[PDB]
């Protein structure tokens with residue numbers, strides 16, 4: 001056992017935070033929350049990528065110091081994530097002095113291993129992606145002016161020709177070991193088609209990789225190469241190292257880093273159990289990073305999960321915004337999170353209209369979950385305001401019980417893939433089954449007609465709501481608490497695999513107090 005270590009990418013601070021960053025960090029957050037619910041030690045990590053030409057030039061364009069610009073924008077990222085109400089354990093910044101030391105330490109290992117030489121890069125480079133590209137991965141496009149230029153096929157951003165004496169990492173020498181790693185861990189990249197992409201790309205051959213740049217090109221906004229002040233460390237080698245840095249930082253109660261340990265084993269976090277990333281940055285994580293780790297003799301991550309990129313009303317996000325805080329203030333924080341995790345799987349296919357948002361809010365959160373919670377806690381149905389003791393189970397009772405008992409196992413596998421969408425769907429399939437059982441039994445009639453039968457129906461329903469809610473708690477962290485409070489579930493029973501079990505809450509447990517205008521999810525007007 002070790003600390004379950006989950007990460008998000010660290011984001012460029014060239015501009016203000018937006019939905020892409022909020023989405024990636026949310027996924028990271030949800031994975032961490034699920035493992036805490038299982039009672040595991042978790043360290044969840046996010047942060048900002050603050051060096052490089054991209055960032056330094058964005059600061060120049062605003063006519064501000066790189067130190068002042070990065071600090072200000074990093075501040076906006078922290079404020080946004082705070083407001084999004086994640087449970088991230090640490091926010092790292094690559095300008096941190098302790099991160100810097102770790103980067104120099106990793107570089108030195110790579111050099112001492114013989115995997116870094118002085119050579120030349122002569123080729124295309126995308127500043128906006130901080131990415132080296134071959135002629136096969138560029139094409140014709142236009143400037144900011146509208147003059148003809150070359151652009152990345154990858155991303156569409158302008159590319160430039162670089163010809164510089166650079167320190168080069170021997171990535172070509174790691175091809176075989178990388179292929180061995182992919183084939184021996186066929187779950188290590190998710191989803192499967194991105195795993196195939198990576199293997200196909202590495203099968204073709206790998207060139208060596210420039211890991212430094214001449215200091216002027218960078219506007220001196222980068223980590224100097226140890227032993228050679230004319231060169232700065234490639235922003236991506238610096239950036240990827242944040243995962244190692246974060247694995248080695250002791251953090252105090254307020255979230256401040258207070259100490260860098262010498263050895264990752266001391267904190268038991270490294271290597272990451274899951275790196276959450278966008279598809280745009282797959283090669284850095286699935287090819288370069290494991291190669292750096294193999295060179296350094298460090299263990300490799302267990303999973304890399306790469307999600308897709310987004311649209312609002314089937315259009316690129318100018319004249320089309322999606323501010324997550326404003327949407328969350330509009331429809332709800334947990335509701336917005338549910339929507340983002342339910343609507344998209346590993347694709348760009350998601351309908352992010354306010355229409356579809358309202359349809360899921362009303363249909364799934366309000367009509368399926370909320371209505372159910374209200375039914376089984378209603379004083380008109382649950383006359384004694386408690387968990388009743390069930391009488392004998394019918395076959396129908398048992399079919400539903402069986403679904404509830406099976407759910408934790410199924411949801412668990414989905415959370416570990418990870419495929420959060422599938423986990424949510426599984427839980428809601430069980431919520432729908434519970435609703436249909438309740439409709440079929442009509443407990444409102446049973447109050448008058450067979451109060452004994454009602455004890456059974458009502459107990460099964462409460463327990464189905466409790467289990468589904470426990471498994472939804474990583475997705476609806478605030479609302480799950482409210483639900484548990486309404487059900488009167490003691491704190492101890494709100495986490496731990498012990499409580500995945502059917503029957504964990506005893507009969508006789510009292511419900512929470514009923515507030516005057518109780519409303520868990522408010523249906524919105526279709527507009």
Ligand code: MET
Pocket residue numbers: 008009010011012049239240241242281
């Ligand atoms: C080590 S993850 C670095 C990600 C990069 N800063 C980006 O925003 O795409």
